Design a protein around this ligand. Structure first.
Ligand code: POV
Ligand code: POV
Ligand code: PTY
Ligand code: PTY
Ligand code: YZY
Ligand code: YZY
Ligand code: Y01
Ligand code: Y01
Ligand code: CA
Ligand code: CA
Ligand code: ZN
Ligand code: ZN
Ligand code: ZN
Lengths: 675, 55, 675
């Protein structure tokens, strides 16, 4: 039971001011005139009177989009400050032209008319403003330590951040870009890249910068979709500041630009150089052509080596043929690797240092070619780009393992000369180490074949999606490792008092890899291995029993093991499944764009003339006119895009408002004529 | 003025009698009073600490 | 290169007819008059001329909602057939009144004006039509063999079905129900039930009948939400054609009606009879009150038996107290069942026919009370309702098992007198069979405790959701069983040649329940058991080996087992998981309504005065004025609902059309006045 009052009271204006505001709002070309005369003579009305909701007479007239009252008030020298911004926001060209013809605010004090027009993206008002030689400030580098930036960040961080965001939002306007830039596509590429990089430095305002970068990418794509001819498309794609613009787009991660249908058709035409009407043929004949071209890989290569200008020697220069030949060569290498571990070719397993066999002699040139190709690619093409592939890491590991295997084999051959039973060799015998490294490198080289899946229309998107989920798998791995370490520490602390020697165990075997598992929690390493193997159910339940009858200790150990099993197998795995599902739901939307970007990147690596020969055979020893053409095509594209966007801007609300205003104007004119 | 309701757990005779005669009317009246009190415009107009009042 | 022509040409009308139609469409009170005069005199115009798009002049005027031309044409005796339907569909009251004042069509020939008005759900037009003593046909029973129905279904099934659907769609109109029914709530209940039952007989038009039933349910609920007082709510809920209307709603499956907040408050007030301000107390004190009331269950019952009118004897008549007492009694029975299988109370396991122990003597009265209560409930309350619970099946199985156990114990006690080692008893000893049946009944009785979860705010919805998924689990069971039978047949056919006797096996054990598993696929029963147990990984891999060296047979058996494992564990289980997820996604939306319906059904079973005592103690031996009140409250509710729906019918499109038409009319009037 407490009354309600007004705490922050507003100082009301007099009846004269209220009547003046009412007349201004209603619209009376004569009553407002006589009110202004009275204000001039007797000062009964304040010319600068303000509505309690901060709405002066000029603002009321602007919101009423009637220009006669505004012109009269301008002639009467009313306070005109901060009215051009209201006109711009209301998007009224006539009023904007009128004010351009010469406390409390709804706009921050850093906003300029040109910036506000750019935020609105109105081409007609932006052009009108830019016609009067306006400028826009440009911000400092993302990581800048200059005194002016440091002082600004030290006095008003909120103001600094808001000003930077406003400037970038103005600069990212498609209409401003089209009006003021000479290379709109390149400008959009660079601006999108800069905004994407800035979003992670200003982590608080991340979504705004993300949306600005998306806007720039959409503008570039939509500008590309306005091409009407193959000649125009080639002029756009081949412009050098052979497909220089496409390479720049790939560098700047313009996936929607690259995956556009007109670009994909050009790329496919370049890809199928020697097979006109490839999509006309049946899948059976295409498959048979693939097999026949694959089997002739040793030829077409010797021909290219002995006669590049010959008809046969020019066949391997086509991208699809080159890809098929490289694939066939890699498959042959893998088949020899398979042949290495067979009974047919490898015998006499009793020699300490064995000379290389025929299969190893055949294998060596492939390894040399792989290493030479990796080094040559890394030298020619950029060192910093070589590491942003995530497959070159596998290549490096595989080649390092092969080099270590060769070195260990040579060392063993030099050091050892004779025979000895394998059962009495030491643990660290060079032959044993070389065999282990060879097996690991075989696994890696066989797993490398995944990267060829992106060339297929059915397996490529699936491979991209799996590669996208791998990161979140890596995210869960951390929590799992922490839980595993905690429980391993506890179990080892409990059980380390009951260690036994291998002598007293059956068969003199110690650990969990024996037929009767024992000493599962005697050391930290063994405890970690046991807790890892219990995830798949390969650890038996009698490993929690000690030889003595310590029932309390055995029960505590069993309860520890059961709690670990519950936490690991009932909770963490199901949470992993749930978040896998959530990730795949979002990933499945953009699978096509990512797959086409990946396939374009894969195709573009076979276009150049470097590294034509497969690894087995690769170790044997005017500008102005182009600028005018680009400018003409850009003019046409910008005109078409602007016209299309203007015709799209026709909306029901705008049309209804325009018709209502026009009908009101005509009715007023007819009433005045009658009167 | 606007009436203000009793504590969430109140045993006063007036609350008990009201809940014993017309529970539907009592609940509807309480909900209407709280819906009126939770108005942003009313808060901004009549409160001196709108943030604390909203909290 | 083939030209395009017109195949189904329309016979065009003459220039006179085209001019007449143009004048009618444009609107000319004098030009149309002189055209009609010319048609009368020289017959230059056809009064019945039709637009090529089937649009006569009267239809054009109706779509123009100008009544002067329609009245003039009616005075001129133009073909007026099938125009009232167009007026009704356009929903123009003035035109409808005008035509009511006295080839090609867009309406099927079975549609009447009243049916069309009911389809539109316009209260103003429905009332206007019903004021003139109109009727609507009513259809025959869902399963009717009368000659007229058989002949109609034998001549035109499409026409018959369309007519039935149209009649039901007209009858299911909320405005028609409110206008013409004396008990709208009961009418909505019955109509929704009938439509729901009809949807599964007309399986082709299932969705239409489902939507009609949903419409009826929504109407009944929305009518209920218009109560403003507890007295009105009690009048509505207690009306008998003690909560008769609520019981009818429960019988007709009106979940949204029952789960409404005003009804739930009344039910909670009835439920907490002896605890005013129950929700005011803390959860700790509420819990402690629950425990104390539970422990005093033997008392409050003897008090009710020896003095029902006493202050102590009237406590058990409250529903919450009765529920707590029954729960405590059941928990005591389960605790005695737990005590049955302990070392403290049961000894001397060597007697063939043993006399009952003290725990069994204590157990027997509970079983007798359970059986008596089941029989009494089944007699008093309806036999056909007793089977639609799906818990009474568990009750019946449990009580049958207890009866069989008692009978077998009595038979064994009568037949056997002496002692014998248990190891030399036969397979079918009555004591062994009775023990097995007792254990199974113990499992069932312990599992019965699930039904008490619906009383809790956290476990109830979860239990309802699981019970909803059980049906789809049952759906997958069929496919799994078929696959299992196929593979069992194949494996038994392959392996039945290598059966071995138990004598030659170690420990003289035969089957897969031995320590060394053998004869896994020797018989069909054993093959089925092995293939069942392989789902959980409890079958070892050496069971596919025969004693002889038949490598082809062993490999074929291993491949069969591997194919079965892949199909069962990699495909079917993952599909089950996927469809579980899909089912839960839809189930999670309406969990609250279903849970509240279930809790209301559970609460209502403790309101009546029959079966007050728990099973241990239950074996010891005017209408007119109510009608006027209901009619008044129904009048108020219908008026409020109609007013609310009318105020909700205000839409932007309708308001804009009305304002445009009114402005056009006023402009025309002003122009005529000026002229
Ligand atoms: C991941 C990226 C890197 C990939 C691998 C690059 C380097 C490859 C090869 C490195 C070869 C090291 C030298 C081997 C001989 C020298 C020697 O004395 O070895 C000592 C240790 O030797 C070992 O324990 C062998 C370890 C080999 C690497 C195992 C992991 C490979 C992962 C592969 C990826 C999965 C012998 O023991 P001791 O001193 O007698 O005591
Ligand atoms: C589900 C709904 C029904 C529930 C159960 C109601 C009926 C309960 C009890 C039925 C009792 C049958 C009579 C037992 C003694 C008579 C006799 O000679 O038995 C013969 C067979 O005996 C058996 O094989 C026992 C079978 C008992 C039922 C097992 C399934 C219970 C499922 C419970 C639900 C899960 C002895 O063999 P023989 O003739 O010597 O050769
Ligand atoms: C005593 C030691 C004994 C060891 C025994 C085991 C030896 C073998 C170990 C194998 C380890 C895992 C190897 C996995 C190979 C396949 C990788 C996944 C393939 C896939 O679908 O994802 C690709 C990623 O692969 C990649 O990026 C390739 C990652 C290569 C890592 C190499 C590490 C060495 C996608 O392709 P993408 O790269 O485009 O993905 C997006 C980048 N933004
Ligand atoms: C030699 C033989 C050896 C046998 C050894 C095993 C013996 C025990 C066998 C146990 C078989 C399964 C028992 C399951 C008990 C719980 C049932 C599920 C509970 C649940 O959440 O769902 C309720 C359904 O329960 C129900 O409807 C209860 C179903 C009772 C079936 C009894 C069959 C006998 C929902 O409740 P709801 O009924 O409202 O569900 C909607 C009806 N529209
Ligand atoms: C980070 C992740 C946060 C997750 C936090 C939740 C953890 C759940 C902990 C549950 C403890 C279960 C311990 C059971 C146990 O050790 O028994 C072994 C020992 C064996 O010696 O058994 C017992 O001591 C008690 C036997 C009865 C156990 C009842 C089972 C209840 C557990 C339900 C889990 C559902 C499967
Ligand atoms: C109704 C459901 C429709 C589903 C239809 C699909 C069925 C899948 C059939 C796959 C056959 C797998 C048979 C493998 C087998 O029997 O090996 C046992 C035998 C053991 O003797 O092994 C072999 O004969 C070949 C060994 C290599 C097998 C390669 C594994 C490929 C299977 C991938 C499955 C993924 C897990
Ligand atoms: C699962 C087992 C059988 C793998 C055996 C290894 C190789 C025989 C496979 C592994 C990946 C395969 C490659 C995966 C995808 C492609 C792309 C494919 O190109 C297309 O499909 C082009 C037409 C299109 O775009 O659809 C040509 C075959 C090739 C190189 C495949 C050749 C055969 C490869 C090397
Ligand atoms: C998992 C183990 C511990 C089960 C042991 C068996 C019994 C001790 C449990 C099983 C189900 C329980 C019942 C489940 C739900 C309820 C409803 C509950 O009622 C409310 O919560 C009312 C208030 C509300 O609506 O939230 C009162 C206890 C009771 C009967 C529980 C009493 C104790 C029961 C019989
Ligand atoms: Ca590489
Ligand atoms: Ca029952
Ligand atoms: Zn700076
Ligand atoms: Zn109070
Ligand atoms: Zn009939």
């Amino acid at each position: 039971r407490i009354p309600l009052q007004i705490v922050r009271a507003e100082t009301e204006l007099s009846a004269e001011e209220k009547a003046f505001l009412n007349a201004v709002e209603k619209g009376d070309y004569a009553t407002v005139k006589q009110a202004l005369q009275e204000a001039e003579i007797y000062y009964n009305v304040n010319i600068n009177c303000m509505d309690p909701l901060g709405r002066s007479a000029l603002l009321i007239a602007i919101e009423n989009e009637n220009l006669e009252i505004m012109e009269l008030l301008l002639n009467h020298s009313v306070y005109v400050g901060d009215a051009l911004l209201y006109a711009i926001r209301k998007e009224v060209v006539g009023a904007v032209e009128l004010l351009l013809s010469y406390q409390f605010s709804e706009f921050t004090p850093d906003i300029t008319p040109i910036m506000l027009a750019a935020h609105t993206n109105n081409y007609e008002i932006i052009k009108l403003l830019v016609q009067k030689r306006v400028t826009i400030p440009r911000p400092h580098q993302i990581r800048c330590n200059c005194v002016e930036c440091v002082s600004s960040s030290e006095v008003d961080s909120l103001r600094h951040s808001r000003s930077r965001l406003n400037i970038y939002k103005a600069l990212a306007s498609p209409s401003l870009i089209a009006l003021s830039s000479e290379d709109p596509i390149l400008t959009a590429f660079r601006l999108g890249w800069e905004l994407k990089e800035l979003s992670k430095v200003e982590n608080e305002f991340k979504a705004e910068y993300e949306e600005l970068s998306q806007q720039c990418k959409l503008f570039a794509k939509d500008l590309l979709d306005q091409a009407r001819s193959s000649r125009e498309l080639e002029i756009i794609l081949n412009h050098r500041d052979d497909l220089a613009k496409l390479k720049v787009a790939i560098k700047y991660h313009q996936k929607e630009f690259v995956a556009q249908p007109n670009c994909q058709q050009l790329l496919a035409t370049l890809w199928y150089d020697g097979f006109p009407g490839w999509r006309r043929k049946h899948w059976v004949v295409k498959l048979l052509t693939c097999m026949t071209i694959g089997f002739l890989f040793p030829m077409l290569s010797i021909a290219y080596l002995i006669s590049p200008r010959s008809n046969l020697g020019l066949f391997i220069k086509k991208p699809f043929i080159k890809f098929i030949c490289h694939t066939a060569s890699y498959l042959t290498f893998l088949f020899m690797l398979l042949l290495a571990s067979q009974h047919i070719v490898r015998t006499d397993l009793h020699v300490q240092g064995p000379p290389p066999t025929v299969v190893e002699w055949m294998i060596l040139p492939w390894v040399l070619g792989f290493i030479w190709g990796e080094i040559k690619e890394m030298w020619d093409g950029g060192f910093t780009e070589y590491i942003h592939d995530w497959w070159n890491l596998m290549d490096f590991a595989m080649n390092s393992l092969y080099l270590a295997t060769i070195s260990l084999k040579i060392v063993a051959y030099v050091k050892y000369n004779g025979s000895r039973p394998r059962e009495e060799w030491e643990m660290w015998h060079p032959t044993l180490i070389a065999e282990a490294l060879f097996a690991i490198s075989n696994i890696l080289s066989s797993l490398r074949l995944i990267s060829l899946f992106t060339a297929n229309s059915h397996l490529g998107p699936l491979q991209i999606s799996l590669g996208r989920m791998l990161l979140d798998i890596l995210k869960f791995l951390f929590i799992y490792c922490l839980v595993l370490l905690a429980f391993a520490n506890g179990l080892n602390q409990l059980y380390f008092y009951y260690e036994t020697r291998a002598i007293d165990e059956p068969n003199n075997c110690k650990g969990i890899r024996c037929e009767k598992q024992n000493n599962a929690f005697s050391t930290l390493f063994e405890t970690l291995q046991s807790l890892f193997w219990s995830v798949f159910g390969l650890l038996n339940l009698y490993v929690t029993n000690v030889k003595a009858r310590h029932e309390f200790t055995e029960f505590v150990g069993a309860t520890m093991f059961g709690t670990y099993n519950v936490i690991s197998l009932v909770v963490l795995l199901n949470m992993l499944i749930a978040m896998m599902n959530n990730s795949y739901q979002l990933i499945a939307d953009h699978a096509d764009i990512e797959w086409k970007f990946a396939r374009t990147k894969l195709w573009m690596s076979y276009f150049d003339e470097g590294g034509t020969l497969p690894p087995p055979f690769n170790i044997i020893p005017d500008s102005l006119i182009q600028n005018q053409h680009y400018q003409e095509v850009i003019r046409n594209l910008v005109k078409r895009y602007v016209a299309a966007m203007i015709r799209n801007s026709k909306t029901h609300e705008g049309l209804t408002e325009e018709n209502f205003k026009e009908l009101k104007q005509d009715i007023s004119s007819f009433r005045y004529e009658v009167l």
